[PDB]
Design a protein around this motif. Structure first.
Motif, PDB file in Angstrom:
ATOM      1  N   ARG C  84      14.087   5.488  -6.775  1.00 17.60           N
ATOM      2  CA  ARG C  84      12.665   5.147  -6.896  1.00 17.60           C
ATOM      3  C   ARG C  84      12.364   3.645  -6.734  1.00 17.60           C
ATOM      4  O   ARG C  84      11.382   3.155  -7.285  1.00 17.60           O
ATOM      5  N   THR C  86      11.574   0.432  -4.240  1.00 15.48           N
ATOM      6  CA  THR C  86      11.351  -0.202  -2.953  1.00 15.48           C
ATOM      7  C   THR C  86      11.868  -1.650  -3.006  1.00 15.48           C
ATOM      8  O   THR C  86      11.518  -2.401  -3.909  1.00 15.48           O
TER       9      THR C  86
ATOM     10  N   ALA E  57       4.833  -3.022  -1.342  1.00 14.07           N
ATOM     11  CA  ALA E  57       4.790  -1.741  -2.046  1.00 14.07           C
ATOM     12  C   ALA E  57       4.046  -0.680  -1.250  1.00 14.07           C
ATOM     13  O   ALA E  57       4.456   0.481  -1.210  1.00 14.07           O
ATOM     14  N   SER E  58       2.970  -1.106  -0.593  1.00 16.11           N
ATOM     15  CA  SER E  58       2.071  -0.220   0.133  1.00 16.11           C
ATOM     16  C   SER E  58       2.671   0.228   1.447  1.00 16.11           C
ATOM     17  O   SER E  58       2.717   1.418   1.746  1.00 16.11           O
ATOM     18  N   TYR E  61       5.704   2.400   1.105  1.00 17.93           N
ATOM     19  CA  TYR E  61       5.178   3.705   0.681  1.00 17.93           C
ATOM     20  C   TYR E  61       4.673   4.552   1.839  1.00 17.93           C
ATOM     21  O   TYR E  61       4.856   5.784   1.864  1.00 17.93           O
ATOM     22  N   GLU E  95       1.275  14.206  -5.339  1.00 10.97           N
ATOM     23  CA  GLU E  95       0.393  13.049  -5.345  1.00 10.97           C
ATOM     24  C   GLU E  95      -1.036  13.576  -5.407  1.00 10.97           C
ATOM     25  O   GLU E  95      -1.710  13.492  -6.440  1.00 10.97           O
TER      26      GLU E  95
ATOM     27  N   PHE F  37      -4.017   4.741  -2.880  1.00 12.72           N
ATOM     28  CA  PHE F  37      -2.822   4.058  -3.324  1.00 12.72           C
ATOM     29  C   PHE F  37      -3.133   2.732  -4.004  1.00 12.72           C
ATOM     30  O   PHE F  37      -2.863   2.568  -5.199  1.00 12.72           O
ATOM     31  N   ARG F  71       6.922   3.437  -8.610  1.00 12.70           N
ATOM     32  CA  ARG F  71       7.118   2.859  -7.291  1.00 12.70           C
ATOM     33  C   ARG F  71       7.637   1.430  -7.427  1.00 12.70           C
ATOM     34  O   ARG F  71       7.187   0.515  -6.727  1.00 12.70           O
TER      35      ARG F  71
END
Lengths: 83, 97, 103, 95, 97, 78
Positions: C84, C86, E57-58, E61, E95, F37, F71
């Motif tokens: 999990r 990144t 992060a985006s 993802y 999600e 998001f 995340r």
């Protein structure tokens, strides 16, 4: 006394019954073995952890709580059995 | 004699099992299975009968959740029959291994 | 020190402070800052190992984030651990699905 | 000018222990430091529950140990317990 | 000479999986970020690292997401990703609902 | 603003994503997706800032948010 092949306890009508509560209507024949495959990887995961708790608690008996803590660990929290 | 058409009892059975909550895997087989796997991790383990029952509760939930998402994958593929490859896509996407 | 007394490179002191202050329990054993600093040391080695390798493979003397990512995603066991996470400036592994390839 | 801590220098020393003729960027150094803190929390955290679960007030090397066995994948756990049990015994040697 | 449909798409995949540089020009992204936050609180400042963090992060993802999207496309004997894939991907991720 | 997330930018992300061919409707879909998001992440982020009594949203608020949301990101003060 020795224990062998028990995954085949998971009969086909049951792996069926679950799929129905699951909303599945038509089941391919190669599904029943894959499900057992999956159920096994699943139980091997919860019990590896359940057991590690049991070993830490220095016990020969696995408790409802060791199970519940394991599930919580694996992000599959369960209500109904303590905790 | 009489013969319900293919898919007719499936739909019935779905509705049956979606009304109730009683466990679907038989109790005894289930236990034998769990005792096996656990033995093969450490010998000489006992279980609170409620601890098996926990693992089963947790087991069926998962698989029913699983079939749910499998089923979606069947339908994604303009199909109505679930297949190992479907399950396989659900697990890749769930990020299981 | 105690890093010495345990053959560790990782600050056995620092760690004992952090456990006590980070509200994990009332009291904190003497072995645990050592056991843990070690496990921390162990794992940072495995990463530095395979990343360095990767920097050799990618022909550089200095490790950039990518080399970490490559080391991590290519290791089956490390990748799980950081399942999990990144990693900034990691990029992805090269992977192109068969049926997408030319005939 | 505030004295912000990290694991930077020790990461380096260990880098030398494994790849003597190799270096690192600041950007990757952050990642190594992040990695350390994350792993530290996860292990510390597990250990913490372990204690609670067992109605006990102390986080010993044992708690840390089993924490490690829940947190880590089969092989990586295995070595970890080694290095763990090793450095501890070696520590309890000296005084 | 001209290169065929999807030939440059194939060469591009290779190029981007080999690189780690960010793919949305950070300025319009940055404006998107400030806009969205204003809706939660007024008169706000962002650390430039705070914006990068979000950006990484985006993207990471979204890439992950296309990966899984792309598998669904493929699951449907297709080669083009479509919104119906994303919806299935996310659905199974849990999600979206 | 949102439409500032350009078609080509979205194409690149899908290329790094492993994707060969892209429908037209994707590009907008991507946008809603990306929006949702950031919202969730920035909502959590700001909440940290609001609680830190700060005008400046920091990196650590972001980082804490991503953790919250599963995340986790490395390289901004883990």
């Amino acid at each position: 006394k020795v224990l062998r092949d028990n995954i085949q306890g998971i009969t086909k009508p049951a792996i069926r019954r679950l799929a129905r509560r699951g909303g599945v209507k038509r089941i391919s024949g190669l599904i029943y073995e894959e499900t057992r495959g999956v159920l096994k990887v699943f139980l091997e995961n919860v019990i590896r952890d359940a057991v590690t708790y049991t070993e830490h608690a220095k016990r020969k008996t696995v408790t409802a709580m060791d199970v519940v803590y394991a599930l919580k660990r694996q992000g599959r929290t369960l209500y109904g059995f303590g905790g | 004699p009489h013969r319900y058409r293919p898919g007719t009892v499936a739909l019935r059975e779905i509705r049956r099992y979606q009304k109730s909550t009683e466990l679907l895997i038989r109790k005894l087989p289930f236990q034998r299975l769990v005792r096996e796997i656990a033995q093969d991790f450490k010998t000489d383990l006992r279980f609170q009968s409620s601890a098996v029952m926990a693992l089963q509760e947790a087991s069926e939930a998962y698989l029913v959740a699983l079939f749910e998402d499998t089923n979606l994958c069947a339908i994604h593929a303009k199909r109505v029959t679930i297949m190992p490859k479907d399950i396989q896509l659900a697990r890749r996407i769930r990020g299981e291994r | 020190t105690r890093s010495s007394r345990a053959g560790l490179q990782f600050p056995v002191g620092r760690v004992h402070r952090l456990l006590r202050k980070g509200n994990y329990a009332e009291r904190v054993g003497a072995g645990a800052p050592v056991y843990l600093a070690a496990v921390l040391e162990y794992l940072t080695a495995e990463i530095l190992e395979l990343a360095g390798n990767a920097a050799r493979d990618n022909k550089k003397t200095r490790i950039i984030p990518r080399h970490l990512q490559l080391a991590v995603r290519n290791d089956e066991e490390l990748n799980k651990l950081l399942g999990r996470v990144t990693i900034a400036q990691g990029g992805v592994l090269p992977n192109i699905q068969s049926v997408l390839l030319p005939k | 000018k505030t004295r912000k801590e990290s694991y930077a220098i020790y990461v380096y020393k260990v880098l030398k222990q494994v790849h003597p003729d190799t270096g690192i960027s600041s950007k990757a150094m952050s990642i190594m430091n992040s990695f350390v803190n994350d792993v530290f929390e996860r292990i510390a955290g597990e250990a913490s529950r372990l204690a609670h679960y067992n109605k006990r007030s102390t986080i010993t090397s044992r708690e840390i140990q089993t924490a490690v066995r829940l947190l880590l994948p089969g092989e990586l756990a295995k070595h970890a317990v080694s290095e763990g049990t090793k450095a501890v015994t070696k520590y309890t040697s000296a005084k």
